[PDB]
Amino acid sequence: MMLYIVFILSVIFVMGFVGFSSKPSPIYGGLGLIVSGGVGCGIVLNFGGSFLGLMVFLIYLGGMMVVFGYTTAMATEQYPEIWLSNKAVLGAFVTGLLMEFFMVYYVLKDKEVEVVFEFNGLGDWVIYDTGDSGFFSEEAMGIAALYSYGTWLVIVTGWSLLIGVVVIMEITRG
Amino acid sequence: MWFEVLPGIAVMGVCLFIPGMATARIHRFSNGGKEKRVAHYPYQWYLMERDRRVSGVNRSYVSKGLENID
Amino acid sequence: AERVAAFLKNVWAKEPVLVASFAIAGLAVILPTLSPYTKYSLMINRATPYNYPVPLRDDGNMPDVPSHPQDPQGPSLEWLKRL
Amino acid sequence: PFFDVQKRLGVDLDRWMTIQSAEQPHKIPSRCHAFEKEWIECAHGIGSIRAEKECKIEFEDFRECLLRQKTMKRLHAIRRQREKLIKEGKYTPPPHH
Amino acid sequence: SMMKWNRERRRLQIEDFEARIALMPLLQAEKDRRVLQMLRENLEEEATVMKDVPGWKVGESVFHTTRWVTPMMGELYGLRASEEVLSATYGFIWYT
Amino acid sequence: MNLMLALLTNFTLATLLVIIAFWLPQLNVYSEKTSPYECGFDPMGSARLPFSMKFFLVAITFLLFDLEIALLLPLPWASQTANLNTMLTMALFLIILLAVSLAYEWTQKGLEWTE
Amino acid sequence: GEYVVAKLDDLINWARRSSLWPMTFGLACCAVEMMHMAAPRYDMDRFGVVFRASPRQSDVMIVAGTLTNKMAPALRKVYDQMPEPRYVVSMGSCANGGGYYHYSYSVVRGCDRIVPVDIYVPGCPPTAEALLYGILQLQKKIKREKRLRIWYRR
Amino acid sequence: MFMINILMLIIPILLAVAFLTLVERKVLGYMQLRKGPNVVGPYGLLQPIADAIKLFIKEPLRPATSSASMFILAPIMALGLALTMWIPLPMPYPLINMNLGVLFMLAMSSLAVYSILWSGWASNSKYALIGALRAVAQTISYEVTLAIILLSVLLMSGSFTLSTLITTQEQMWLILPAWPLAMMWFISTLAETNRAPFDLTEGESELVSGFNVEYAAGPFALFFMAEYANIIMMNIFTAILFLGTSHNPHMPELYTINFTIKSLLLTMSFLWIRASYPRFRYDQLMHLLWKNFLPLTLALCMWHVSLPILTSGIPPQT
Amino acid sequence: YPTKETAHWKPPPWNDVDPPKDTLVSNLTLNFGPQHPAAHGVLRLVMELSG
Amino acid sequence: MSMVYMNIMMAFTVSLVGLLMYRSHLMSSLLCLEGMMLSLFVMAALTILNSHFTLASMMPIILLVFAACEAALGLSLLVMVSNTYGTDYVQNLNLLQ
Amino acid sequence: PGIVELPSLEDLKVQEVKVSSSVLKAAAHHYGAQCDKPNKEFMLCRWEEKDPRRCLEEGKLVNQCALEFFRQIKRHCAEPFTEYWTCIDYSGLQLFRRCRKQQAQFDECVLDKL
Ligand SMILES: CCCCCCCCCCCCCCCCCC(=O)OC[C@H](COP(=O)([O-])OCC[N+](C)(C)C)OC(=O)CCCCCCCCCCCCCCCCC
Ligand SMILES: CCCCCCCCCCCCO[C@@H]1O[C@H](CO)[C@@H](O[C@H]2O[C@H](CO)[C@@H](O)[C@H](O)[C@H]2O)[C@H](O)[C@H]1O
Ligand SMILES: CCCCCCCCCCCCO[C@@H]1O[C@H](CO)[C@@H](O[C@H]2O[C@H](CO)[C@@H](O)[C@H](O)[C@H]2O)[C@H](O)[C@H]1O
Ligand SMILES: CCCCCCCCCCCCO[C@@H]1O[C@H](CO)[C@@H](O[C@H]2O[C@H](CO)[C@@H](O)[C@H](O)[C@H]2O)[C@H](O)[C@H]1O
Ligand code: SF4
């Protein structure tokens, strides 16, 4: 059961997506996205990417905090909609969960499932690397190479972030 | 007087001392009287797993020395 | 040099926080160039062995490659022992 | 690229990240390093039209390393049969398995 | 003070790294034997389990090449206990 | 496992305390008690009405600054590279461009809240 | 049976009277002597009495001053918004019975026309010490509650 | 033996938090020329117990207009995440030894913000909403500066492991080479914990009680417990970050004694600061961080990137 | 080519600028007191707030 | 493919349908855009981590950087849309019919 | 596509160096000098053959030289060596810097005797 840790997180991942894709009040859409960021961090962490996982969680926590502030100012109505309050939202929410459940049921019932494309349901551990005895994290060396190897990537990303500040000020200066 | 504030600080101090002391003692008790092995990197984990196999009792904190070399 | 002093002293009175920032930022950019120790930083990073030193197949003409780790040939870390 | 300014000027802006057989930090190899190199060396210089046909073996093996689809199908075949034999009281796993 | 201590820590790291280098040949030899033993054990079990399957061939390769391929987790621990598989796969990542 | 055990215990204890808090006390619920609070007089309109954000431009800039840390957080690892000449130039380059972006927004009054 | 609930009353009573949080609520003159009870000489905080602004986090309402007709609906509102158990201390002649504005067209003749009152502290204003006497009298009222003993005998 | 270890962590935390409230009331009392609790138990020692019992037998309220699920969820996250912040702390041995303990605490602290946003929002009252949006403003002010301040310190430690900070400070406290960062870090922790002079989300004199104005009894207590647990945790983190205690592996209790004294004194200073200063205006908090701390933090970040290289003092990865 | 679905279409403004909406943005109205620590207990300060 | 891919791919599809099927709030659709990046980030990370391609470990980070720019760009437009009509409703953006 | 050739279980059997990692870590520096030649040949084989099956024989000579190395320590330096790795074993990170005193005793023992 614990061998299926990554699969169980991925099931909650999709459920979070159905949470905000059904598009209730952005207050609850932000909540759904925070959950997905959380178990999304858990998924990446279980593949050996502790730094990558924790950062996507951190970035999305700050982003939804800005979203929450913008929702109260510009995307709020007298009766914010929950998943049960609207037929279109509930219908989308229900449809996504039932489509999620059945995919889970077959892949667990058979250890393989065909959903447009063939997926193997043996558990995700089977693909992992067997040997490993380096005295470092591979993700850290790869990420740290951004400053030695990725000189060109730093220039374009640094420029875009600088331009982003200039652009947002032009756009919002009516 | 101001030293009547000390009793509440000491009780607060003693409570904050317990978590650090308990963890240190529980680690030694469950690791054969030694510090808990730290495995931050794959190499350290590899050696720890090897010790579990070498121990013969499925415990990475049970050490085998020269008496295990024939 | 007198015009700049008036500006420099003026900003020390109005924006000492920003004066301190630019000064520290300036030092961060300049001193690495002028420091006699900057060279050792890369050598110490070079001398850290993360990987196995794979041996070479001896062909007969490798005078400077050692046969044993304790042989005199090869890079020495004596400079680091005393750094 | 559309305009191969990198080759002309000799600069190397992004080719370093293109393949997993390229030089990695501290020479950490990718899992499919050998399979990539064989496919890249098989198809070098001959073009995609020829390479699609004359390097199928190298590519097919490389694809197997990447997604392991044939291997997982084999394991599911073995695992499924053991379930059949274990459940029928026909085979018994040894102590170590 | 921070300079001097960190230089010493770098000297201590190299010493620690050199001990690992000295043992790597011994650990590598053990690893090679352990992997081959596990696969040979896997191969034998496959022979009995798949005996009555007609199209099966025991120990077949999925690769056109005869070059040695490192096995993945499923290939090596495919037919073993869950807690042995669990420790092999997520043991390091979960360790505290 | 240990981490998952630790998280479950933390949020299990918190939930137990809430459960106890809700089922132990004697309750007397009526409309006036549960009406929205606003200093003794009835609220004038819905608390769900839009609430203007005066620091909206700083809030967007936070999203762009809040991603500089992801690019800079690898620096302690990058300091272990052999190619320190390229490192230090690129690390200083990013921070300066971040400083320049801050100076631009500052000088153009982007950090002043709208009235 | 009787012994267990007897001790349990003593415990819930002790906790409730040792942790009395008045609403930050003053009306007129008498609120000045309420401040002097919080001031160093009397230090209400040393008895466990702590002002908290929110009605939700308050146990006691000290009606400290004249209650006008215009204010009366607001006072009843914040009283209703206290969670239970809750207590009301009527401080000063104005709150007690209208006082020196008793015959005014705009004054409620005693806050006990609006809320139930546990303790009446006389004076115009009561001294800070007199209010402290009233708070300690309220504590001794709470010490005598028999909620569980009565429940047990229902 | 691990479950016992978890209880040996969180039960003492709740006891330390309980008596921190007593110590705060006494320390502020004497700085205010009075005494503070000294009746309920000798020297007020039973006051925290009485307050705890009273709140949990007080009637909880669900406001009529409130969003029920988020109203109840919010206090559970607050206390749950406050206790989670302690599992990586090396005292001297962590309960959970993380490679990236520093970044884990950054992520959990960001998540704990939502327990304010959702409690204020779910309350569906204006004072609660105003408090919640101050929390949004306050996070924007300190989060960017806080992370970069940490990064500068970790460039002398070489790791994101909290235990490596103990090894870095074996010969000397990091407050010597980084007192400018320690100053800005100490302020950032006050802003991060909504502590005076940055107690804005609650802000008694402006917002009655701010984000939790509608909370009563037990649900209120969870928020109060979470706040004071965060006060202690952030001062432990400050002590570990800048006042490293030497660790003797054969006498780990001596570390825990010196380490605890430093954390108590740092926590006492939070109370001391609360008694001394007026409250910031919450747009003045944003300008303090963005116009003062941020320019200096960015400059010191470049300085501490360069300094190990130019002095050849780069730490090890381990 | 006129059609019934486009009978309500007007040519766009000459200078591309549509008139600003006549809609009035509504400011939040708040009771500040009487029961408020900063209201002296009996001030009902009705404030209109933008943010 | 591995079973995790089934749910990550499903997650991308759910957010894609989420983005394409609008309601009223323009903010709700901007969340479906951040949802797509989150799944793209996760699915890229699994591929890169599993295959041990070290140099691309920076790729998911760069992905987030340009997701932040898009979200900041999207929020800026939502500010000006809201300032004009008093809501973020998308049915108000029909002058150009 | 072929049947993977795996060695027999007898061809894999060998005497195992069954000591803990703290024992190996304590003797690593001397072990590196003493058993360099068999170890280096075996490591040259692996990075050349790229096949664990093609290096088995050299991998047995690695163990036989390790056992002979640890058999000499037992004959002459059993007690000083036993204190030293015990000190290493206590540490959570098996640090050298916490056992310099015992490292000396083992260091001059192997110098005087061996
Ligand atoms: C940091 C954590 C601190 C937690 C502290 C927790 C408190 C510890 C001290 C507990 C002492 C006992 C408290 C009793 C207070 C009850 C409230 C009260 O006074 O009401 C008066 C009522 C009496 O009401 P009554 O019947 O006389 O009349 C009520 C009707 N009117 C209003 C008209 C008068 O007491 C009771 O009804 C029963 C008393 C029970 C005492 C024992 C407690 C059992 C409760 C179990 C409830 C069932 C759900 C389970 C909840 C989980 C429990 C753990
Ligand atoms: C607009 C919505 C977008 C939603 C995106 C959803 C995820 C899409 C997944 C794309 C990958 C699917 O991959 C698809 O299925 C399997 C993958 O092994 C392949 O399967 C097929 O092709 C390969 C080719 O050698 C062979 O195994 C065989 O011919 C056959 O099995 C398909 O050729 C491939 O096209
Ligand atoms: C608007 C765009 C702004 C862009 C601003 C960019 C600022 C960059 C300033 C230069 C920073 C690096 O500056 C450079 O650092 C390296 C050290 O790493 C130094 O190099 C020195 O140390 C290295 C290793 O540490 C040795 O290999 C080398 O022999 C030695 O010269 C250079 O002498 C110095 O000139
Ligand atoms: C490399 C990292 C360190 C480098 C520092 C990077 C950040 C630099 C920040 C910008 C500094 C110059 O840009 C800034 O522009 C504004 C114009 O509104 C100036 O002037 C303004 O600032 C202050 C505070 O806001 C006001 O009291 C003043 O009334 C106003 O004129 C500032 O005095 C100047 O500091
Ligand atoms: S009772 Fe006396 S002191 Fe109190 S409000 Fe009335 S007139 Fe003023």
Residue numbers in the entry:
A (entry chain J): 1 to 174
B (entry chain a): 1 to 70
C (entry chain b): 1 to 83
D (entry chain e), J (entry chain K): 1 to 97
E (entry chain Z): 49 to 144
F (entry chain A): 1 to 115
G (entry chain B): 26 to 179
H (entry chain H): 1 to 318
Manuscript excerpt for this entry:
Complex I is a 1 MDa multi-protein assembly that is central to mitochondrial and cellular metabolism. It oxidizes the NADH produced by oxidation of carbohydrates and lipids to maintain the redox state of the mitochondrial NAD+ pool, reduces ubiquinone-10 to drive the respiratory chain and oxygen consumption, and pumps protons out of the mitochondrial matrix. Here we define the inhibitory drug-target interaction(s) of a model biguanide with mammalian respiratory complex I by combining cryo-electron microscopy and enzyme kinetics.
Substantial evidence of disorder at the ND5 lateral helix / subunit NDUFB4 interface was observed in preliminary maps, so the dataset was subject to a separate local-first classification focusing on this region. There are no density features that can be interpreted as a tightly bound biguanide nearby. Considering the positive charge on IM1092, it may interact with ND5-Asp554 and/or Glu559, thereby disrupting hydrogen bonding from the lateral helix to subunit ND4, or interact with nearby stabilizing phospholipids.
